[PDB]
Amino acid sequence: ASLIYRQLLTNSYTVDLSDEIQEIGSLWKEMQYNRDITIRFKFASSIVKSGGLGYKWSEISFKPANYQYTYTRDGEEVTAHTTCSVNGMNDFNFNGGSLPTDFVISRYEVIKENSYVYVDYWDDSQAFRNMVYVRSLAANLNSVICTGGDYSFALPVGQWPVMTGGAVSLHSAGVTLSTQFTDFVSLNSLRFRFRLTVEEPSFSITRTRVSRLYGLPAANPNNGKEYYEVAGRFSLISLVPSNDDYQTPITNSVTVRQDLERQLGELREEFNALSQEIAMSQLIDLALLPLDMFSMFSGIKSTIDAAKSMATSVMKKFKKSGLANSVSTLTDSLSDAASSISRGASIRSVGSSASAWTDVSTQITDVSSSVSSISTQTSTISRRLRLKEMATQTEGMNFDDISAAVLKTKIDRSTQISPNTLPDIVTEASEKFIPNRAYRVINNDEVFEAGTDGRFFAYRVETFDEIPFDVQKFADLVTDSPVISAIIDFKTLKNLNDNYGISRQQAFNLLRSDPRVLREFINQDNPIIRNRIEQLIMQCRL
Amino acid sequence: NLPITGSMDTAYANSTQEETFLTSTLCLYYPTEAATEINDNSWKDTLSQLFLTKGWPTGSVYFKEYTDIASFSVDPQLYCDYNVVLMKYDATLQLDMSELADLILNEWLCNPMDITLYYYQQTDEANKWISMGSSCTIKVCPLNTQTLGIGCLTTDTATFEEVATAEKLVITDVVDGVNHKLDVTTATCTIRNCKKLGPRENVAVIQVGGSDVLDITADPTTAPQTERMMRINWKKWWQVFYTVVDYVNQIIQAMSKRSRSLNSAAFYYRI
Amino acid sequence: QNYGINLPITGSMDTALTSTLCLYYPTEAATEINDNSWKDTLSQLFLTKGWPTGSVYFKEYTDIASFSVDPQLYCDYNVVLMKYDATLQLDMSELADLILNEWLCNPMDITLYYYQQTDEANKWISMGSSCTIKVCPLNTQTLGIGCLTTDTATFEEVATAEKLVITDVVDGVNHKLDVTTATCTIRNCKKLGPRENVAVIQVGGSDVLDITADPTTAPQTERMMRINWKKWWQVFYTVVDYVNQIIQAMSKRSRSLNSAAFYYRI
Amino acid sequence: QNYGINLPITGSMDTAYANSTQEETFLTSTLCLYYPTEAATEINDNSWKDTLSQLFLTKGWPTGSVYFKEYTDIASFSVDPQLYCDYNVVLMKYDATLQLDMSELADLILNEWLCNPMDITLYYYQQTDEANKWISMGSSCTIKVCPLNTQTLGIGCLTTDTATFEEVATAEKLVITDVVDGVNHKLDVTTATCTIRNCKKLGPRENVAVIQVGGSDVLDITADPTTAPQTERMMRINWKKWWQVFYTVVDYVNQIIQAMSKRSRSLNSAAFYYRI
Ligand SMILES: *[C@@H]1O[C@H](CO)[C@@H](O)[C@H](O)[C@H]1NC(C)=O
Ligand SMILES: *[C@@H]1O[C@H](CO)[C@@H](O)[C@H](O)[C@H]1NC(C)=O
Ligand SMILES: *[C@@H]1O[C@H](CO)[C@@H](O)[C@H](O)[C@H]1NC(C)=O
Ligand SMILES: [Ca+2]
Ligand SMILES: [Ca+2]
Ligand SMILES: [Ca+2]
Ligand SMILES: [Ca+2]
Ligand SMILES: [Ca+2]
Ligand SMILES: [Ca+2]
Ligand SMILES: [Ca+2]
Ligand SMILES: [Ca+2]
Ligand SMILES: [Ca+2]
Ligand SMILES: [Ca+2]
Ligand SMILES: [Ca+2]
Ligand SMILES: [Ca+2]
């Protein structure tokens, strides 16, 4: 289950890829609204003429156009407002010559297959005031044909050129949420995308060497039509805040905690309270799942926007936390130690040979309690054995597995979810879950053990009796050999052996944190292992 | 549906023909010209008494009249436990009569087709589009992945391919796996997406005159004549009804109880 | 191959240019469709069924009579959409007889030589603008029976203005032949067997085809389909949709080098 | 009997040779002689057919089996050349300006071709392998080709304007077009008066021999520039009088037929492979 953390870090690069496009871009009840809509829209034309005698036009281009109308839907006269715009246009040009006399078109816009037509749509119906929290949204529409019409050019001399022809089919491709800016309020609207397909009518300009040109110029794209109409259906699923099964809001304009809080302050208490209802054996079963990104983030009942960015938002927050910086510092220290036989003096070794895993550092030191040097050394080492946990250099199930299992079983139960809450609750959970955790390394039927709390223990596997802890041997063992998380750490092991005489195989498995022995002991309702796992779960307190 | 283990040594049970004749109803469907040529207001009672001689209790035989094959094809409601449709043969209507047979000699699971908003396709050989009404003029425009049409423009119905005109019933079969845009006169027609499940065993069709032309399967490689498709030559309708009455046991033998559990809304004439 | 043709093939019971399609349709079909791009649509619809772009070919013929004038079979698979006409039954049969079977034909010089049909597989197939076959059976003395070898007006007429006709006379009897050699040509043909790469779909009507001269048999093979129709678009849609079944009835192993409907030997 | 399968045949060395079958094949085969009109014109004897038939009889052939088919010239004979005899011999007069036409004719008749129809108005056509060609025949067949790139746009030409098409054949009675393989070409063919077919060269046609009357070794029946094979069925003869040419053909008919063999595609044993 710890794999999720690793994967987030591993995938953190994609987060950057998101930000780029983003900065290029700019309980609950499900209620359904399938509505048969009729989008009536149109284009506008900007015809800016150049100086001189009027033979030259500086620009003849598209311009967004607004439209209002009323139509019948299930016997309801519904007033609708739409705004049509275009994107990705081809800037053709005509250059009759350098003289002021010759027909010149500096830049005229034609929409082709590489363009897109965007249409905001709104109405005063119920469906369009329930779409603040949206689960799913999908619209189908019959394609429409937009043909270009005639447009004569105002030359006072000679034949009048005419812009005839031109046609494109708009086919529905995608619908999203959008906003209409009024004078004093802001309206939620449905913005439909339409892909263009060139059609047989080819637009040409008379008095010119222009023919068999395809697209839809901006000159007279309406072709005299009052509007362009597409009839279809849009399906919307809205998440309405409801705390009882008999009520259902007509409108969902309700405020949620994240509309007012950006730093979750009291949701920490919600999580700490949720911790009570956690089962033990089933938690182990969940912790043994290789929880990947899909498994972790598939079961959350999100909104339309939240699901679209859950993984990358979580990862954006993830590649900043103390865990990510600790991983980065460990990697840099290892690379520096490997990169130069120059500063073995700067680093001081608590082992036979120098290693980044076995270096002593700042440790401002705590005179509050009489502290042995060995305790400080072991604590400093264990704080990096945590990065060993998150570097696939462990053997048994690790504390990170338990942390991930608790995180999953809590986020699914927690009713507090939002595009900003899941970030900083996954990351801060990984940071603050099980802060005091111990590790052990086995060698020649002897177990060495260290803890971030500063407690160290050396003992024998066959019989759990403590041994003079041999620093400079625990360090050499721990730099290379597999490191085992101490789920059933020495004290619990000795208590269990004294009270519940365990077999050689059971002790073997418990030492290496084998899941099977753990779950079998839990199923027997053994108070000691249950107590230890309860302490571990309550340590996952965020 | 459970496994049914039986012994090959079991003894044949007595004839159930009398019991089924007593506890079931028979429906006879005939064209209006039959009653015209017969020219007798009591012919229903005469046939009822003849059937009673054959065994059917009085009232179990129901006689239903239809103007012609085209009119009968508009939602043919078959009531009785056993249905026999006397279908006059017309060389000009070979498809239409066939379609009618295909509609009533098979079980169809149908759902509505809201064409004006949705794009439809046929998934397998059992899938067809059954359209019924006063005038069903269906035009089809095959499409592609880019949603464009093949030899047709979705925005210009005039370019849609004509597959039916002024039809009371038509079974449309198009290429499977291809989306089509459909333009049919919804005012005087209703088109349903249907799957044929299997034979409808309680409906037999007796073609009065002509030759074996029925093709109840769209597959060109099969033109099967099941035991429920009879064909009799004729010159008088009284002889037709006499031969139907006399061989009623044979006709019912060729038929079996419907056995299907339906969800539609149709009245029945049962005992 | 030929040196291993007369060798056994042993098999165990316990063991477990690409193809091209030609569609022959009457011109009235294309007239009814009234579209000038229907071929492209049908080609793409076939491509849905797995036929590459340049594989399906559409060949138009005016009617059954004209198509029967030395028909040519071009593709690997030849599906012939034949419209049914109650007045042309025999002709339809003749076409099927000439199209669904393989024939071996030799030149016939009626003016200089008498001719007889050796066995039941031997027929006289004549094709052209218009055939008028008149037959005078002879006897052992070479004198006509009910006919005069010199007077051709007494000859018994068996064909009149035929674009195609398969004549079957009494075997073992010599016949003097009067044929309109100017406008059509006759050949002594032998039916070898089925032509498995050609299927015939009868559009409308009833089962009337008889591809065997024997009166006691009228076999309907798997390559002889029949469909009821009202609109040619539906006909072509059902042909396209069930092309798998149509090809299943056929075998690609009968496409001769040339497109002729008969092998020709001098 | 087993017609659809290619079964291996095991022969044994030391198996005694069978007697000569030349007499039996002469008695049970037909010979077609294809000559130009100028041959008959120069000969100027209305009975020369009977004389040649009697001479062939002296050589073995029954006097009903040698056929004499006359063609105007190479160009006209190239339109649907139909050769039906068991053994076909073609006397082709050589013209220094018609080398490619003679080569095309020989390639068409000295080799077996499997041809499918072509709809240039419907499909873009591509040649798959070296054995694939486009054989077109008609009264006046003019072929222009526009190669297309992967985007279907033409290369060095516009698909809309056939004037930019690259002309490969002009007023040809017969032409075998070979274009680059694996490239789709839009075709512009004068279909109104000529037919184009997409053909494969299955292999040699062993029952057709061509005697080039008075030229040099110029026939190239293979489109590969690196090969110009001279098969046994393409002979060359110097000439001044057509009577001498026909006497040489009659006198060496044994050798000419020896150079040829029964059409492999023909006869019963070729059944269910392509033909009979
Ligand atoms: C109370 O919380 C503990 C751990 O925090 C948990 O084991 C226990 O099940 C919870 N509830 C009850 C009713 O014991
Ligand atoms: C069946 O028929 C036989 C012979 O007619 C008769 O004896 C018997 O009673 C009938 N009924 C049953 C249940 O066997
Ligand atoms: C072959 O020729 C030889 C010698 O001329 C002769 O004896 C024999 O009969 C001929 N026929 C066969 C079948 O061997
Ligand atoms: Ca109908
Ligand atoms: Ca059309
Ligand atoms: Ca279908
Ligand atoms: Ca059928
Ligand atoms: Ca005829
Ligand atoms: Ca007579
Ligand atoms: Ca005979
Ligand atoms: Ca027969
Ligand atoms: Ca040439
Ligand atoms: Ca060019
Ligand atoms: Ca090539
Ligand atoms: Ca060469």
CA distance D8 to C9: 11
Write out the H or E segment, with its range, that includes residue C127. strand C122-131
Closest CA to B213 of B202, B225, B226: B225
How many Å lie between the alpha carbon of C75 and the closest alpha carbon of chain D? 6
CA distance A13 to B177: 41
Closest CA to A318 of A297, A302, A334, A333: A297
How many Å lie between the alpha carbon of C73 and the closest alpha carbon of chain D? 10
CB contact under 8 A, B154 and A140: no
Q: How far is CA A4 from CA A30, A120, A382, in A?
A: 30, 40, 22
The neighbour count for residue D241, using CB atoms within 10 Å, is 10
Can you spell out the DSSP letters for B224-271? ---TTEEEE--S-HHHHHHHHHHTHHHHHHT---------S-------
Residue identifier of the C-alpha nearest atom 2 of ligand 1: A276
Q: What radius of gyration, in Å, describes the C-alpha atoms of chain B?
A: 21
Chain B residues in contact with A197 by the CB 8 A cut-off are 146, 148
D149: CA distance to ligand 13 center in Å?
Answer: 14
The neighbour count for residue B27, using CB atoms within 10 Å, is 22
Question: Tokens at residue D51, please?
Answer: 């004389």
CA distance B91 to B73: 17
| DSSP code for B24 | -
Can you spell out the DSSP letters for B194-217? EEEEEE-TTEEEEEESS------S
Phi, then psi, of D268 in degrees rounded to 5: -65, -40
SS3 A128: helix
Write out the H or E segment, with its range, that includes residue A523. helix A515-523
Question: Looking at this protein, which amino acid is placed at residue A325?
Answer: N
Mutate to test the pocket of ligand 1, among A272, A275, A276 (most ligand atoms within 8 A of CB): A276
First to last CA, chain B: 26
Query: Please, are residues A291 and A404 in contact by the beta-carbon 8 Å criterion?
Result: yes
Closest CA to C253 of C172, C196, C213: C196
Chain D residues in contact with C256 by the CB 8 A cut-off are 274-276
Q: Specify which residues A441 forms β-bridges with.
A: A448
CA distance D146 to D120: 12
Helix runs in B65-215, H state only: 69-72, 94-104
Chain D residues in contact with C57 by the CB 8 A cut-off are 116-117, 119
CA distance A506 to C232: 81
Q: How far is CA D253 from CA D31, D59, D87, D238, in A?
A: 10, 8, 11, 17
Chain C residues in contact with D4 by the CB 8 A cut-off are 253
Query: Please, are residues C260 and C237 in contact by the beta-carbon 8 Å criterion?
Result: no
Closest CA to A108 of A155, A66, A67, A148: A148
Determine the number of helices (DSSP H) and then strands (DSSP E) in chain A: 14, 22
Q: Does C30 touch chain B (CB under 8 A)?
A: no
Closest CA to A14 of A305, A292, A310, A299: A310
Q: Does B158 touch chain A (CB under 8 A)?
A: no
The neighbour count for residue A122, using CB atoms within 10 Å, is 20
The neighbour count for residue A290, using CB atoms within 10 Å, is 12
Secondary structure of B27-47 in HEC code, one letter for each residue: EEEEEHHHHHHHCCCCHHHHH
Query: Please, are residues D112 and D204 in contact by the beta-carbon 8 Å criterion?
Result: yes
Closest CA to C55 of C35, C75, C72: C75
Q: With the C-alpha atoms ordered D240, D245, D247, D251, is the resulting torsion angle positive or negative?
A: positive
What is the distance, to the nearest Å, from the Cα of residue A292 to the centroid of all Cα atoms in its chain?
14
Query: Please, are residues A408 and A286 in contact by the beta-carbon 8 Å criterion?
Result: yes
Q: Does C5 touch chain D (CB under 8 A)?
A: yes
Total residue count of chain A as it appears in this document: 542
Question: Looking at this protein, which amino acid is placed at residue D31?
Answer: L
Write out the H or E segment, with its range, that includes residue A179. strand A167-181
- Interface mutation target, options C34, C43, C207, C234, chain B, most CBs of B under 10 Å: C234
Residue of C nearest to D66 (CA): C266
How many Å lie between the alpha carbon of C175 and the closest alpha carbon of chain D? 21
CA distance B45 to B51: 10
CA distance A440 to C17: 71
CB contact under 8 A, D116 and C20: yes
Question: Tokens at residue A2, please?
Answer: 């710890």
Torsion angle defined by CA atoms of residues B50, B54, B57 and B62, in that order, rounded to the nearest 10 degrees: -60
CA distance B140 to B184: 9
CB contact under 8 A, A169 and B154: yes
Q: Does B173 touch chain C (CB under 8 A)?
A: yes
Secondary structure of A352-389 in HEC code, one letter for each residue: CCCCHHHECCCCCCCCCCCCCHHHHHHHHHHHHHHHHH
The neighbour count for residue D117, using CB atoms within 10 Å, is 17
Helix axes A399-413, A527-539, angle to 10 degrees: 70
CB contact under 8 A, C227 and B220: yes
D14 annotated as a binding-site residue = no
Resolution in A: 2.9
Burial of D21 (C-beta count, 10 Å sphere; 0-12/13-18/19+): exposed
Q: With the C-alpha atoms ordered A237, A241, A246, A247, is the resulting torsion angle positive or negative?
A: negative
Longest dimension (CA), chain B: 68
Phi, then psi, of A13 in degrees rounded to 5: -60, -40
CA distance D216 to D199: 29
Closest CA to B131 of B157, B148, B113: B113
Q: Does C53 touch chain B (CB under 8 A)?
A: no
Can you spell out the DSSP letters for A186-224? EEEEEEEEEEEEE-S--EEETTTTEEEE-SEESSSTTTT
CB contact under 8 A, D275 and C253: no
Burial of A98 (C-beta count, 10 Å sphere; 0-12/13-18/19+): exposed
CB contact under 8 A, A231 and B116: yes
Write out the H or E segment, with its range, that includes residue A110. strand A104-111
Question: Tokens at residue C33, please?
Answer: 């469709």
Counted across chains A and B, CB pairs separated by less than 8 A come out at: 28
Secondary structure of chain D in HEC code, one letter for each residue: CCCCCCCCCCCCCCCCCCCCCHHHHHHCCCEEEEEEHHHHHHHCCCCHHHHHHHHHHHHCCCCCCEEEEEECCHHHHCCCCCCCCCEEEEEEECCCCCHHHHHHHHHHHCEEEEEEECCCCCCCECCCCCCEEEEEEEEEEEEEEEEECCCCCECCCCCCCHHHCEEEEEEEEEEEECCCCCCCEEEEECHHHEEEEEEEEEEECCCEEEEEECCCCCCCCCCCCCCCCCCCCEEEECCCCHHHHHHHHHHCHHHHHHHCCCCCCCCHHHCCCCCC
Q: Does B154 touch chain A (CB under 8 A)?
A: yes
Q: Could you tell me which chains touch chain C, where touching means 3 or more CB pairs under 8 A?
A: B, D
Closest CA to B84 of B190, B192, B208: B208
Q: Does C104 touch chain D (CB under 8 A)?
A: yes
Q: Which atom of ligand 1 is nearest to the CA of A275?
A: 5
How many Å lie between the alpha carbon of B155 and the closest alpha carbon of chain A? 6
Q: Does C10 touch chain D (CB under 8 A)?
A: no
What is the distance, to the nearest Å, from the Cα of residue C124 to the centroid of all Cα atoms in its chain?
14
C144 annotated as a binding-site residue = no
C203 annotated as a binding-site residue = no
CB contact under 8 A, A171 and B117: no
Q: How far is CA B132 from CA A447, B71, B120, B135, B191, in A?
A: 84, 10, 18, 8, 6
User: Burial letters for C119-131: b for 16+ Cβ neighbours within 10 Å, e otherwise?
Assistant: eeebbbbbbbeeb
CA distance D39 to D91: 9
First to last CA, chain C: 25
What is the distance, to the nearest Å, from the Cα of residue C110 to the centroid of all Cα atoms in its chain?
23
Question: Tokens at residue B50, please?
Answer: 């003849």
Q: Pick from C75, C253, C263: which is nearest to D276 by CB? A: C263
Helix runs in A278-423, H state only: 281-288, 293-298, 304-318, 322-339, 373-389, 399-413
Question: Tokens at residue D80, please?
Answer: 């649907």
Total residue count of chain C as it appears in this document: 266
Q: Specify which residues B235 forms β-bridges with.
A: none
Query: Please, are residues B133 and B107 in contact by the beta-carbon 8 Å criterion?
Result: no
CA distance A404 to A410: 10
CA distance A482 to A394: 5
Question: Looking at this protein, which amino acid is placed at residue B4?
Answer: I
Q: Does C44 touch chain B (CB under 8 A)?
A: yes
C117 annotated as a binding-site residue = yes
CA distance B143 to A195: 16
Query: Please, are residues A348 and A359 in contact by the beta-carbon 8 Å criterion?
Result: yes
Angle at the Cα of D87 (from D81 to D88), degrees rounded to 5?
A: 30
Question: Tokens at residue A525, please?
Answer: 């309702």
Total residue count of chain D as it appears in this document: 276
Q: With the C-alpha atoms ordered A4, A9, A11, A17, is the resulting torsion angle positive or negative?
A: positive
Q: Ion ligand 4 — residues with CB under 5 Å?
A: B 96, 99, 167, 170
CB contact under 8 A, A233 and B153: no
Burial of A325 (C-beta count, 10 Å sphere; 0-12/13-18/19+): exposed
Query: Please, are residues A450 and A379 in contact by the beta-carbon 8 Å criterion?
Result: yes
Q: Pick from B117, B148, B153: which is nearest to A140 by CB? A: B117
CA distance C136 to C179: 12
**Residues within 6 Å of ligand 1 by CB:** A 275-276, 534, 538
Closest CA to B229 of B249, B257, B254: B254
- CB-side neighbour CA atoms (13 Å) of B53: 9
Q: Does D9 touch chain C (CB under 8 A)?
A: yes
Question: Tokens at residue C118, please?
Answer: 């050796």
Residues 398-427 of A with CB under 8 A from B: none
Query: Please, are residues D39 and D64 in contact by the beta-carbon 8 Å criterion?
Result: no
Question: Tokens at residue A79, please?
Answer: 């007033």
Question: Tokens at residue A212, please?
Answer: 């068999």
Closest CA to A524 of A281, A277, A278, A279: A281
Instruction: Please tell me the experimental approach by which this structure was elucidated.
Output: cryo-EM
Helix axes D48-59, D242-251, angle to 10 degrees: 20
CA distance D134 to D127: 8
Query: Please, are residues D214 and D242 in contact by the beta-carbon 8 Å criterion?
Result: no
Q: How far is CA B11 from CA B8, B16, B103, B253, in A?
A: 9, 14, 38, 20
Query: Please, are residues B239 and C252 in contact by the beta-carbon 8 Å criterion?
Result: no
Burial of A238 (C-beta count, 10 Å sphere; 0-12/13-18/19+): buried
CA distance D153 to D140: 29
Q: Does B183 touch chain C (CB under 8 A)?
A: no
CA distance A312 to A6: 14
D212 annotated as a binding-site residue = no
| DSSP code for B15 | P
Q: How far is CA B177 from CA A220, B121, B144, C193, C241, in A?
A: 39, 6, 10, 38, 10
Residues with Cβ within 8 Å of residue D53, at least 6 apart in sequence: D63, D66
Chain C residues in contact with D114 by the CB 8 A cut-off are 17, 257
Strand B82-88 vs strand B203-208: parallel, antiparallel, or unpaired? parallel
Q: Which ligand is nearest to the CA of D16?
A: 3
CA distance D23 to D27: 6
C168 annotated as a binding-site residue = yes
Q: How far is CA C112 from CA C109, D44, D51, in A?
A: 6, 27, 21
D250 annotated as a binding-site residue = no
Question: Looking at this protein, which amino acid is placed at residue D9?
Answer: I
Total residue count of chain B as it appears in this document: 271
C156 annotated as a binding-site residue = yes
* Strand order across the beta sheet in which B82-88 lies: B61-66, B26-31, B82-88, B203-208, B229-232
Phi, then psi, of B72 in degrees rounded to 5: -65, -25
